[PDB]
Subunit: 330 residues, 4 copies
């Protein structure tokens, strides 16, 4: 054989992949995650899982054909979760998506029923994995993945408000003519209608914008900065109305989270975690707060100082999410 | 204003972009080209053009929302080609796209008609850009772009067989247990069914595979390596069958070409250019041969030494394209 | 003749680079800046200049020999400034360096004399460039370079406190178990002994550290955070004491600034610019304040809101610098 | 208190990196390896080891101070090898290096004595690591490390001719006006004066330069291409003459090998390995041949087909090295 004529093999055993990522779901979100992760060189193996065999195999093949231009030497796929074995991170993007005029919270029963199947099959093969939830309603579903998986809370993460804050900072940058990297600002709470812009923390170069205009973000704001948060809240729906779905932004957001996890960076991101104990919250609610994200998931939470109004709004977001948790049928 | 108490302005500027790229067509191919370019930090401004307003705006906004995660500070879109002004590189992906069970050659008149509108508009606003044609059939559409634009031929480049060679190197590498980067070999001619694998040149570490198996790539080949080229030819058809189109691999191939162009690398790529006065060809056929690709587009062609068979197959490819090309209305 | 047998030349070669960087000085700082810039793919051409013939040729060759692992297709050097033609960014690292126990301010007369030769030669061949001053004392020498060059002040930038701030942020993250990217804080003023830590802006996720502990940065501070600023002031001297010189940190800090310039990012950096008209300063003092940096250099300055303490300290740093700059002759 | 006021900790992690790299030796070569590995984001922890306490700590700090600009969240150093624990890859650059005019082979006993300390200490703290030997004479010291470590031969790799080949392709590219990524050719055998350029494999785009010029590489060659290989051989002596040592190219070359290892690429590199069973070699000789480099080190060897004279040159390199190798004391 030509291979043996050309190459002498010196070593048998192949070990476990060392930095494997899995993406569950090959819709537009799932594939945007995949291409983003491949192009950031975060994984030595990428596995894709879905339920539609042709579509899955075709996406797999299309990525494989780009391997020359990549540094991720094994791309594989299957309907069977055995393909996800020894993942360090499994990203769950599967489920129904919200339509125009439909709240993300309306997706809960459909996506809960899917997670009942996906979650036990995912965790079965990957003892070292972190679960990153992207499907919506992401907060509720992070809680659901946590209850179904039986994982510790540090390993179950929701993409949460990482994108909402990315949008906030993009919009802020456009208003100030500064790059989003140098515009700082946190959108916390539900990834959805009840998110909370933390005006008290919005700053360029450590300069609090609120200290320059104490009316910032209030109805009395002459420059109507609240509308930036409104744009944040409406963004998914505005993009859905225009092109049918969203994909690129969330892909890049999830790829940012994946980088912090895979590279043990311990950067702070506003992502879905349990907040029992903070502010007024006495229940097992998941929502976005600033979390330190590393190789073991969320190891620490930053305790953001909130004005009484900000805290009220965050507790309100938490009440909304808890109300839907009480609807969950396990 | 808030901005003005925060920031002391010292320069009005405006400022032209210095590394601008435009993508024409926000279909799946075009947006894959866009995401791969954004993720390779090739451009300081990306402009998108297409004719369906809402689709276009929504793709732009979706990309814009990921700006925090990118290093391309200006992303813009319009139907109006004034948005393309001062591009260094304009990538045209627009037009009818290959359908299931049909040759790329079946798209040719409709895409000629569309290029009759697109190219003068591109030329008008960026008269010194490089044009990179990706729309199918890419070899004829590169010839067409060149005739309509009036550009010298160095500045009119077709994505050609960069992808087919990438696929071939992937498949070869999968056979040999070696990364595609270390598996060398060229598919030339048509980006389509008459492509030519240059078996004479296929090698690993400088070791000609043909020197270990003289029958390599022929009917007489015990290991039927010819099937690897057959897989390259069929790839698009299979991927289209499975997922409806191809996007990721072409996006990555186009970004690779954009990289050589934008960074003046003078790497060699098998890409579409005028072959008049090669291999005994007296017409203005465009097809892939190995080209040195740089800031001034295609500056040089590597004269591949083809066997009589390979030369035969290459002239057959040229004849096939000339036979479609000569009967066009334009 | 081998080249011509291999390659058909299709296009006359005129040698115009589009993203050229020059580094003046091939000492340890200059070669650090060079390698860091080469590894961030910022330039399509790197020129080196110095006055020691052998050292210059050796350094160039050693870089050149790594070209396969890089994407900078041309690396050149000369004593003659014609080698720097058409640079978009010129980075000045040449001059005397501080011994152990010697202030950067003591370098001023020696480095002024050198800048009287270097700066007109650079400006001669690169009329579109930005000048990035790294030579010390950087703040006075940025002023000098500005006066000599006849360039507008936006185009003459000093590396200033970009490094002091990166140190502060590193030290802070090490104290908090957070990546420096997520620890925010500014060190402004002179790149040297009179630099000003802005405690009022020090924050993680927008949470002011000084609000948690109002004693922050004072002698009364039970955790002595003032020592962090001390370590920042002492850093260069401590590293010089230990290894003979500093190189890597400043090389990275200079590559950071070059990225913002070359990619027109408009990020905010604490870098040397004219501050006359802020904080009651009336003379042409240059020092670090947070600036927006892009393709035309410093376009905007952020007016940091300072405590009376911090402001007084900044006025004193200004006074120190004018104390040396007033007497300058050239 | 401040940390605890700011952050709620969720769990006590085992820090324990997944992608730790150790560089032994912080001379010019080691630190160039460190900076290149840092800039290629290959590791989550970098450990440095040397015997000069002050220099070691200086270099560590200088790297640490640039952390803001990197993605390697822990940089440590010690004279104690406990600091190197759980490294996936240990890169040994320590030892005497060539003075001007000095053969690499003259370093041999000094560096064998140093390896007798080093290798057992490395093995002790990372018994599953891959060793990458860079210290000279690299071929013999790869053997010595293999004997002393007791590791399987797959896990003990010498940088070998990776740099010699990179130089060759640089020089070739400069001759042809093509980027060295598109110029292919292999320098094999000893990393030094007896290395063997394999002219039969030298090609652009699969076009054999020797088939265009039958006299290529011969003293009869009109264009004296042999002087390209002479240039390769002389490069380190030339650069050492000019600047006192070599650093950047070897740094880049070692990082490229680290990348193949760490990301399991299974790229092909001409690197030092036990070649017993090839080319008549009956003894445990180490020298460079093209090897498939991955996460388990060298898993496979490509069998290059050498002309009778090429093979003879290589058996020369072999005999030279085994002469010294066979009489070593440890
Ligand atoms: C219990 C019964 C069903 S188990 C189940 N596993 C999966 C996995 C992936 C996806 N994929 C998507 O949801 C992608 C959506 C899109 O096409 O945009 C759906 C499901 S349903
Ligand atoms: C009468 C008007 C003719 S001018 C014209 N300009 C464009 C520009 C872009 C696209 N975009 C696509 O073809 C979509 C791509 C896909 O769906 O794959 C089509 C056209 S038609
Ligand atoms: C009196 C007239 C002489 S003009 C002159 N041009 C240069 C250029 C480079 C350097 N190089 C360094 O100073 C090394 C850099 C460092 O070690 O920081 C010195 C000079 S002196
Ligand atoms: C006999 C037993 C001694 S054990 C020993 N461990 C080390 C570790 C590092 C280095 N460092 C260099 O060789 C770098 C020097 C330079 O290039 O400047 C030398 C040694 S010697």
């Amino acid at each position: 054989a030509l291979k043996d004529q050309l190459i002498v093999n010196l070593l048998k055993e192949e070990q476990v992949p060392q930095n494997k990522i899995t993406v569950v779901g090959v819709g537009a979100v799932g594939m945007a995650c995949a291409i983003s992760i491949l192009m950031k060189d975060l994984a030595d193996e990428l596995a894709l899982v879905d339920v539609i065999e042709d579509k899955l195999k075709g996406e797999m093949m299309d990525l494989q054909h780009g391997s020359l231009f990549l540094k991720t030497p094994k791309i594989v796929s299957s309907k069977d979760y055995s393909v996800t074995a020894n993942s360090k991170l499994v990203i769950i993007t599967a489920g129904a998506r919200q339509q125009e005029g439909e709240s993300r919270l309306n997706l809960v029963q459909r996506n809960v029923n899917i997670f009942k199947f996906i979650i036990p099959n995912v965790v079965k093969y990957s003892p070292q994995c972190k679960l990153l939830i992207v499907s919506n309603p992401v907060d509720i579903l992070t809680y659901v993945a946590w209850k179904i998986s039986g994982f510790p809370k540090n390993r179950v993460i929701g993409s949460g408000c990482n994108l909402d804050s990315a949008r906030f900072r993009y919009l802020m940058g456009e208003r100030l003519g500064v790059h989003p990297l140098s515009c700082h600002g946190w959108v916390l709470g539900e990834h959805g209608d009840s998110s909370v812009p933390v005006w008290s923390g919005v700053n360029v170069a450590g300069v609090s914008l609120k200290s320059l205009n104490p009316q910032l973000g209030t109805d009395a704001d002459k420059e109507q900065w609240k509308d930036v948060h409104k744009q944040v809240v409406d963004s998914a729906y505005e993009v859905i109305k225009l092109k049918g779905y969203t994909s690129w932004a969330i892909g890049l957001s999830v790829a940012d989270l994946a980088e912090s996890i895979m590279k043990n960076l311990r950067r702070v991101h506003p992502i879905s975690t349990m907040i029992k104990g903070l502010y007024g919250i006495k229940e097992d609610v998941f929502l976005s707060v600033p979390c330190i994200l590393g190789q073991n998931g969320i190891s620490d939470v930053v305790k953001v100082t909130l004005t009484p109004d900000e805290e009220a709004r965050l507790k309100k977001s938490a009440d909304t999410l808890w109300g839907i948790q009480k609807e969950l049928q396990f």
